[PDB]
Amino acid sequence: HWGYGKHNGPEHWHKDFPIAKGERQSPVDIDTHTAKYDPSLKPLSVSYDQATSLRILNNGHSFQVTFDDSQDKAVLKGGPLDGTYRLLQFHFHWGSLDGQGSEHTVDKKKYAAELHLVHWNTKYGDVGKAVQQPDGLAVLGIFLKVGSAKPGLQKVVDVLDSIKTEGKSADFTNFDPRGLLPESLDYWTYPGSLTTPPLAECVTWIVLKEPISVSSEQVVKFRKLNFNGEGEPEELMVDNWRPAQPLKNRQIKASFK
Numbered sequence: 001h002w003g004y005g006k007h008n009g010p011e012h013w014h015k016d017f018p019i020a021k022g023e024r025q026s027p028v029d030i031d032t033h034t035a036k037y038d039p040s041l042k043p044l045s046v047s048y049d050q051a052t053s054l055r056i057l058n059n060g061h062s063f064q065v066t067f068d069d070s071q072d073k074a075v076l077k078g079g080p081l082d083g084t085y086r087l088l089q090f091h092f093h094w095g096s097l098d099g100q101g102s103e104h105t106v107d108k109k110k111y112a113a114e115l116h117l118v119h120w121n122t123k124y125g126d127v128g129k130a131v132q133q134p135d136g137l138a139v140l141g142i143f144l145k146v147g148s149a150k151p152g153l154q155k156v157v158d159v160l161d162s163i164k165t166e167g168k169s170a171d172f173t174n175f176d177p178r179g180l181l182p183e184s185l186d187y188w189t190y191p192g193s194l195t196t197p198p199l200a201e202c203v204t205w206i207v208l209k210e211p212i213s214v215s216s217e218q219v220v221k222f223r224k225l226n227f228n229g230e231g232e233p234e235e236l237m238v239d240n241w242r243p244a245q246p247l248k249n250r251q252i253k254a255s256f257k
């Protein structure tokens with residue numbers, strides 16, 4: 001029922017999900033001059049060497065690559081986090097043109113897209129339980145700008161024609177998400193929420209400063225996806241991003257000087 005258009009988009013979500021107007025909603029604008037360096041923050045530990053990807057799928061709001069999270073394989077630790085967070089899935093948000101598509105913004109700058117690597121805190125045992133906790137999930141956010149191709153993304157781009165419509169999925173084994181990471185792990189961090197329903201306030205956000213570059217041909221392939229299922233009127237899956245929400249009583253901390 002919810003989506004991104006005029007009659008069911010982000011400004012409507014609060015009716016079904018009143019937490020949409022809550023105290024720690026995401027995304028936010030990152031004001032780089034106000035974010036303070038926090039020398040107590042650790043380097044992030046992104047340990048993806050043993051990741052086991054399973055499927056790629058169109059869920060009618062994005063496309064997502066899913067991982068086996070039944071043991072500590074691909075894990076995020078350190079940074080602002082206490083304990084161990086297992087990688088469950090990644091997905092993207094993107095625009096209809098290169099000047100929009102990201103959910104977080106940086107001094108009001110919108111990037112062409114944003115990658116979300118979604119991890120959950122193993123102390124809660126399963127992801128369903130984790131989403132009910134204020135420290136249940138950690139989402140690693142990575143901006144995409146349009147320039148040179150990202151070789152590590154091409155394997156994803158090349159299967160999107162097989163999952164054009166909502167409900168479609170495909171085998172997507174042996175995908176290495178290390179190929180989506182920028183050089184620097186410099187980051188901003190703040191407490192927030194899921195950016196799609198149910199908008200649960202369960203996320204420690206870790207947003208990398210350095211964007212990755214993707215080619216115009218790569219992002220064009222994202223824009224050929226459909227929100228609709230096969231047999232319904234074709235409506236391009238574009239502009240599947242929630243706008244920046246009020247920061248309220250939160251501080252965004254920088255890992256870097």
Ligand SMILES: Cc1cccc(-c2nn3c(c2-c2ccnc(Nc4ccc(S(N)(=O)=O)cc4)c2)CC(C)(C)C3)n1
Nearest residue numbers: 026116117118127128131139193194195196197198203
């Ligand atoms: C895959 C899986 C396995 C087992 C349980 C669940 C699950 N169940 N339920 C939920 C979830 C659930 C779990 C994990 N992530 C989400 N959603 C999610 C994740 C990341 C982002 S983003 N854009 O900020 O990165 C936005 C939404 C939802 C939500 C619910 C409480 C209504 C019920 N999901």
Ligand SMILES: [Zn+2]
Nearest residue numbers: 091093116195
């Ligand atoms: Zn997301």
